[PDB]
């Protein structure tokens, strides 16, 4: 029970560390998804994030939502942010103009 | 005023992976062009394409004025 | 050709140390007494790597087509086009890469870069064979 | 064992580029003094172990292959066994195995494809950046396969030349005649899969016209 | 050490590498007869050491001179590249702004480094330095040849001002072409305090 | 080097062809700066304006005295390989005697 | 923004944290990432096709409303890492 | 060794890398005590040497050789005029940049804001933003800092060229 | 073909590697005759 104590703080410490790691990665993806109507650090910081989470930084098989999220986010964030920005200023193309006369 | 500022930054971020990322704006500009060029003596007709008589002096200064600011 | 790659112009990492086996078993030296189909260095450096250099040059010219009869920037002029300073950048880059001294330096790698020049004069000849002609 | 005490191990401080002083291309390769060394070793123990019965760099070859390979009592099928296993499964085992070892060792195949470095940035980073790896990798491949087909010429001699003890010698002779036709095939496709990515060639799916 | 034709020289190539191929043979010698086995060939190291050493330092000097006469030729087709000055006037009033012509600054370097290398041949014979002492080279040795090094370096700087003489006067007619030929007087004016 | 030469005689103008600014401040980086200050040598036009000190390390791989690919192969390979081998031989004789 | 982001995890994770004790620290790795009461509802995230009325943006927000949900829950597991620091407090007491 | 008793109790799923074992224990008490004692060999695997500092400190010292210096020299090395897959250490395992280069790291995103503002031809504010970045950079000048200044002067070139075309 | 010195163009050489981009053409190498030659080579390369 001193080795259940030391074992408890041991695996509690390690799971605290990995919990801090996945907390960091999902925190970064929250920092990505938070950015609406900016579209500029979207591909910058988001593509910086995808270079770590699905990639080498969190490349254990650890979660499902980390794996499916960071594996998914190519087409979702890239295609959705992409065509979001494409139909952005088509709004302005409708707004440019009606002030012709 | 900022009439291509969105098109500017749009073309920047989309031009990280140019250029079909901004090629459909050719289509949207051709379409909403073809609405705004239209019509008033119908005037999406400039693609080898009555309504002639729906035009007079106020419609004239209207028409070539509005097309003039379109060219601007 | 669809440039997946044959290998690349990236044999400069590989093809140094993989000539040691072409010279320590000296291809093919030992290889005791039979009919053994010896060289094999070249035979791909004859066939494969040379045609991969030729078509690799050709696709490299297709990374400077740019679809403009013309447009450019040109501190002194019009200079028509980005095509022009493209083929300048290409032939300057490759003609620093593929040969500097030694003039052959080449089986026909000389004649390869000569063929890139010949294609460039074919295309910018074709612009005048289109706009004027 | 005594085949290229490694270049590019390591760095003669400071003297770092040219690629190093070791290579390039002062690692001659002339015909190689390296190949005078190795092709002196196998000619030494081959025709001098043969001449003997008509660490010395590298005594394990003729030593272990001798006292091993002569102490067989029904050897003649087992020669075909080591041949027919080792050709395909060994050649693809090593040539797979090294590229696997780098392919997860410090990969990071980041510099994923070219990082779009145009076009004709054709192995640009050497210059000692990230083609310091692949030179050590493909160098270690052609080195290991060299000592391999060396040694298969050394058993294709060692007892087959000359009937120690079997005058049915053409087994391992076939395992040079199609031993070397094995390995020169297995490198040749490893030529064609040096495609311009650091192609890493570890998928094996073969799909027909219907997915 | 050259090695090839042009550039062990202008091209600081024996200026860098020659210290390496110098220094290892120096340690190999100093050890190789520091074992005092036995006698009357330690003399032969005392001959061969100063032979190759002084011949080498003469070689770097010769490269540096015939190099540095070609320096300003095909170099300064430039503009006021490097800096500035702070030279006070006759009324001591802030009158510089004397700038720049970077061929000043390059030849301000390529002799200072050669001073560092020849410092590492004159003062080479300190750090070896073991028993017997078979001290086969004197740490502050050749006062005759030290005066000769003073002579050759003086000839080097004289070759510099000759190089601006030829490059200024006729090579050929453009410091740019009067177009600040005042550039050339600006460079010389910096050279009076460089 | 050079057969059918520049003729004559094939200098690189290497104290420009390298040392326009180069190893001129990289081989001279254990060489420069040692009190080699700037005095507004922020090169105020365009490019060579890093120049603070120690390090802001560029810190050039320094191809050679620049255009010497093969001549740095010559001085390097010849002089360093031969003298390296003789360092090994004198080591073995140092043990032997 | 409390342990209501991990409500049943006060049993479904914390009892497996209290007397579990973590069994077997791959479940604390992966099944606490499959995340009893938090990301055991891990289905249909999904950045919903079809066309952007239905929905493609709310389910895209719910593609990472585990960054809301399982990270105020994993953050609540980081708040339970403070309870694991409380387990490291008493694990600093009996040790 | 997966815990696949859900498809079949008294059966095991040991899929070692490029393999798969259906090594079916006959009783399930040997299966439950087998994956249970392999979960106690995850109290040996997952507790003894899973990582616990191993991938942690291996990621520390191994990540600590990042772009080019660990391992200083150097006589075949430089990283002056490039980005060359630029290791964004702020977004990497440092996240905790020094508030000089942290607050200028967001002004490195302010440098990218200058790239937006240049990219819409609005020079003025981006120029003065760059003046602020020169001010804080200038004053509070710990190693990557210099490379940040390289990007800065790169973009000062971009401005000077761009205005000199635009005038 | 004349390189010659540049710097031009873009990454201040942007190619600069350059082992004939891939060769030495390292014949065996083993062939030091060198012929005292020639023009370099008109060879119809001049005609090229």
Swiss-Prot record, chain B:
Subcellular location(s) per record: Cytoplasm; Cell membrane
Self-association and partners: The exocyst complex is composed of SEC3, SEC5, SEC6, SEC8, SEC10, SEC15, EXO70 and EXO84. Interacts with SEC4.
Reported function: Component of the exocyst complex involved in the docking of exocytic vesicles with fusion sites on the plasma membrane.
Protein family according to the UniProt entry: Belongs to the SEC15 family.
Other facts: Present with 4280 molecules/cell in log phase SD medium.
Listed name of the protein: Exocyst complex component SEC15
Source organism (scientific name): Saccharomyces cerevisiae (strain ATCC 204508 / S288c) (Baker's yeast)
Lineage summary: Eukaryota, Fungi, Dikarya, Ascomycota, Saccharomycotina
Residues of the full protein shown: 305 to 405 of 910
UniProtKB/Swiss-Prot annotation, chain C:
Intracellular or extracellular location(s): Cytoplasm; Cell membrane
Superkingdom, natural source: Eukaryota
Signal sequence coordinates: none
Subunit architecture: The exocyst complex is composed of SEC3, SEC5, SEC6, SEC8, SEC10, SEC15, EXO70 and EXO84.
Described purpose of this protein according to its UniProt entry: Component of the exocyst complex involved in the docking of exocytic vesicles with fusion sites on the plasma membrane.
Family statement drawn from the similarity comment of this UniProt entry: Belongs to the SEC8 family.
Protein name per UniProt: Exocyst complex component SEC8
Organism encoding this protein: Saccharomyces cerevisiae (strain ATCC 204508 / S288c)
Encoding gene per record: SEC8
Positions spanned in the full protein: 546 to 678 of 1065
Swiss-Prot record, chain E:
Signal peptide positions (record): none
Top-level division of the source organism's lineage: Eukaryota
Additional notes on this entry: Present with 3400 molecules/cell in log phase SD medium.
Assembly: The exocyst complex is composed of SEC3, SEC5, SEC6, SEC8, SEC10, SEC15, EXO70 and EXO84.
Job of this protein: Component of the exocyst complex involved in the docking of exocytic vesicles with fusion sites on the plasma membrane.
Family: Belongs to the SEC5 family.
Protein name: Exocyst complex component SEC5
Native organism: Saccharomyces cerevisiae (strain ATCC 204508 / S288c)
Lineage, broadest ranks: Eukaryota, Fungi, Dikarya, Ascomycota, Saccharomycotina
Gene: SEC5
Curated annotation (Swiss-Prot), chain G:
Recorded coiled-coil stretches: 72-95
Leader peptide range in chain numbering: none
Quaternary data: The exocyst complex is composed of SEC3, SEC5, SEC6, SEC8, SEC10, SEC15, EXO70 and EXO84.
Other facts noted in the record for this chain: Present with 2340 molecules/cell in log phase SD medium.
Family: Belongs to the SEC10 family.
Task performed by this protein: Component of the exocyst complex involved in the docking of exocytic vesicles with fusion sites on the plasma membrane.
Protein name per the record: Exocyst complex component SEC10
Origin organism lineage: Eukaryota, Fungi, Dikarya, Ascomycota, Saccharomycotina
Residues of the full protein shown: 3 to 97 of 871
């Amino acid at each position: 029970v001193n080795n259940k104590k030391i074992s408890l703080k041991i695996s509690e410490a390690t799971i605290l560390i990995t919990k801090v790691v996945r907390i960091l990665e999902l925190s970064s993806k929250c920092q990505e998804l938070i950015t609406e109507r900016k579209f500029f650090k979207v591909l910058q910081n988001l593509d910086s994030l995808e270079k770590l989470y699905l990639q080498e930084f969190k490349n254990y098989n650890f979660q499902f939502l980390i794996e499916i999220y960071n594996s998914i986010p190519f087409l979702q964030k890239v295609t959705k942010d992409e065509c979001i920005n494409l139909i952005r200023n088509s709004l302005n193309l409708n707004l440019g103009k009606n002030l012709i006369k | 005023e900022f009439f291509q500022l969105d098109d500017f930054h749009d073309s920047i971020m989309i031009f990280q992976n140019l250029n079909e990322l901004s090629v459909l704006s050719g289509e949207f500009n051709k379409e909403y062009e073809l609405r705004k060029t239209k019509l008033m003596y119908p005037l999406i007709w400039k693609k080898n394409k009555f309504t002639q008589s729906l035009s007079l002096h106020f419609l004239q200064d209207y028409f070539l004025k509005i097309l003039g600011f379109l060219l601007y | 050709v669809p440039p997946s790659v044959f290998n690349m112009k990236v044999i400069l990492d590989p093809f140094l140390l993989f000539t040691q086996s072409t010279s320590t078993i000296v291809p093919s030296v030992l290889t005791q007494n039979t009919i053994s189909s010896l060289t094999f260095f070249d035979d791909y450096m004859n066939k494969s790597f040379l045609p991969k250099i030729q078509m690799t040059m050709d696709y490299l010219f297709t990374v400077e087509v740019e679809s403009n009869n013309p447009y450019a920037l040109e501190l002194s002029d019009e200079n028509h086009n980005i095509f022009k300073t493209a083929l300048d950048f290409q032939r300057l880059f490759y003609n620093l890469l593929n040969v500097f001294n030694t003039a052959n330096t080449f089986r026909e790698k000389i004649s390869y870069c000569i063929l890139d020049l010949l294609n460039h004069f074919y295309n910018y000849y074709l612009g005048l064979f289109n706009s004027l002609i | 064992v005594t085949n290229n005490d490694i270049f590019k191990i390591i760095s003669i401080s400071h003297n770092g580029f040219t690629s190093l002083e070791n290579y390039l291309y002062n690692i001659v390769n002339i015909d190689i003094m390296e190949h005078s060394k190795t092709i002196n070793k196998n000619l030494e123990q081959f025709i001098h172990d043969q001449s003997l019965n008509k660490q010395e760099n590298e005594g394990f070859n003729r030593i272990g292959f001798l006292l091993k390979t002569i102490n067989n009592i029904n050897k003649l099928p087992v020669a075909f066994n080591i041949i027919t296993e080792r050709a395909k499964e060994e050649i693809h085992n090593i040539i797979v195995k090294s590229t696997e070892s780098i392919r997860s060792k410090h990969p990071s195949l980041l510099k994923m494809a070219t990082s779009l470095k145009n076009d004709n940035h054709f192995g640009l980073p050497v210059q000692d950046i990230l083609s310091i790896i692949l030179r050590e990798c493909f160098w270690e491949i052609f080195l290991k396969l060299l000592y391999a087909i060396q040694c298969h010429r050394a058993i294709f001699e060692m007892s087959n030349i000359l009937q120690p003890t079997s005058s049915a010698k053409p087994a391992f002779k076939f395992n040079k005649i199609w031993g070397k036709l094995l390995d020169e095939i297995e490198l040749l496709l490893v030529r064609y899969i040096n495609d311009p990515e650091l192609i890493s060639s570890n998928n094996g799916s073969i799909k027909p016209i219907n997915g | 050490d050259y090695g090839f034709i042009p550039p062990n020289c202008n091209g600081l190539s024996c200026l860098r590498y020659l210290p390496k191929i110098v220094e290892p043979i120096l340690k190999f010698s100093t050890e190789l007869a520091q074992l005092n086995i036995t006698t009357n060939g330690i003399t032969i190291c005392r001959n061969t050491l100063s032979t190759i050493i002084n011949r080498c330092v003469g070689a770097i000097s010769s490269t540096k001179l015939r190099d540095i006469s070609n320096f300003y030729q095909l170099e300064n087709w430039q503009v006021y590249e490097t800096v500035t000055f702070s030279s006070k006037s006759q009324d001591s009033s802030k009158n510089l702004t004397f700038e720049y012509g970077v061929t000043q600054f390059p030849e301000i370097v390529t002799s200072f480094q050669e001073v560092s290398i020849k410092t590492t041949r004159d003062l080479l014979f300190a750090y070896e330095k073991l028993p017997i002492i078979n001290g086969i080279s004197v740490v502050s040795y050749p006062s005759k040849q030290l005066l000769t090094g003073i002579e050759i370096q003086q000839i080097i700087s004289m070759e510099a001002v000759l190089e601006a003489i030829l490059k200024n006067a006729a090579k050929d007619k453009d410091n740019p072409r009067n177009s600040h030929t005042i550039l050339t007087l600006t460079n010389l004016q910096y050279f009076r305090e460089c | 080097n050079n057969t059918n030469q520049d003729k004559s005689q094939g200098c690189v103008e290497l104290s420009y062809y390298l040392k326009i600014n180069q190893l001129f401040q990289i081989i001279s980086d254990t060489g420069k700066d040692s009190e080699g200050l700037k005095s507004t040598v922020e090169p105020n036009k365009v490019n060579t304006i890093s120049g603070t000190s120690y390090l802001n390390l560029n810190c050039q791989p320094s191809s050679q005295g620049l255009t010497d690919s093969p001549t740095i192969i010559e001085m390097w390979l010849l002089i360093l390989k031969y003298i390296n081998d003789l360092w090994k031989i004198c080591d073995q004789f140092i043990e032997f005697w | 923004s409390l342990y209501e982001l991990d409500p049943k995890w006060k049993k479904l994770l914390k009892t497996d944290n209290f007397l579990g004790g973590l069994t077997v620290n791959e479940f604390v790795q992966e099944l606490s990432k499959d995340h009893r009461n938090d990301v055991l509802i891990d289905a249909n995230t999904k950045n919903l096709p079809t066309n952007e009325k239905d929905q493609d943006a709310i389910r895209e927000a719910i593609w990472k409303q585990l960054d809301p949900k399982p990270y105020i829950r994993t953050f609540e597991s980081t708040l339970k890492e403070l309870k694991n620091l409380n387990e490291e407090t008493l694990n600093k007491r009996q040790y | 060794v997966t815990q696949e008793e859900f498809s079949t109790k008294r059966l095991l799923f040991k899929f070692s890398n490029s393999n798969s074992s259906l090594y079916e224990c006959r009783d399930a008490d040997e299966c439950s005590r087998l994956l249970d004692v392999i979960r106690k060999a995850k109290d040996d695997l997952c507790d003894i040497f899973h990582v616990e500092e191993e991938n942690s400190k291996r990621i520390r010292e191994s990540f600590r050789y990042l772009q080019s210096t660990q391992q200083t020299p150097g006589r075949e090395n430089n990283r002056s005029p490039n980005k060359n897959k630029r290791r964004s250490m702020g977004g990497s395992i440092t996240p905790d940049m020094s508030s000089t280069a942290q607050r200028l790291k967001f002004l490195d995103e302010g440098v990218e804001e200058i790239d937006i503002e240049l990219a819409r031809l609005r020079f003025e504010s981006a120029v003065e933003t760059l003046l602020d970045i020169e001010s804080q950079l200038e004053d509070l000048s710990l190693m990557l800092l210099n490379l940040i200044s390289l990007k800065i002067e790169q973009r000062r070139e971009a401005i000077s060229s761009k205005l000199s075309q635009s005038i | 073909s004349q390189e010659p010195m540049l710097d031009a163009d873009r990454l201040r050489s942007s190619w600069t590697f350059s082992e004939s981009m891939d060769l030495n053409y390292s014949n065996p190498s083993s062939s030091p005759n060198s012929l005292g030659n020639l023009k370099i080579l008109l060879d119809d390369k001049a005609s090229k």
